[PDB]
């Protein structure tokens, strides 16, 4: 017998990384007073882009 269709599974989508309000913040900083931070332990969607 041959198969018919594919099934892919994974638990509920967990805590997303909060990209959004980093870019929806009141404002960014200067060039010499520039901003940097590091994100880990969270999923990044890239879909909204």
């Amino acid at each position: 017998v041959q198969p018919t269709e594919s099934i892919v599974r994974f638990p509920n989508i967990t805590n997303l990384c909060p990209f959004g309000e980093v870019f929806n913040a009141t404002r960014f900083a200067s060039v010499y007073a520039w901003n940097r931070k590091r994100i880990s332990n969270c999923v990044a969607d890239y879909s909204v882009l």
Binding site: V22, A25, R27, A29, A33, N35, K37
Partner: protein, 116 residues
Amino acid sequence: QVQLLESGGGLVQPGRSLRLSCAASGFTFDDYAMHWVRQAPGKGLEWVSGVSWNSGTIGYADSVKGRFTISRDNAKNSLYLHMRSLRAEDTALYYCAKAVEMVRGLGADPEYGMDV
């Protein structure tokens, strides 16, 4: 035990470049807004500068337009203010502090909260 150490004092000439450092401890630094408050000797207390959680300069006072610099060393949990072109009256008992309001708590970025 929230703690803020202020340095940059001594006898200094007006009109000269000055470096002030405030070290923060006892609380996670780079998640809060932060404030410098002017305090002329023999006078009252007035707001001079501030900076956002993202290390964003709030601005400068009326008489000091575009000639001070506020920056934040996120690496070693510190904050610096550089002054230029001092006069006899720009002397102040500058104070350092943070903001009570947390990120994602209670719109817009909260930046008030003259606290410690």
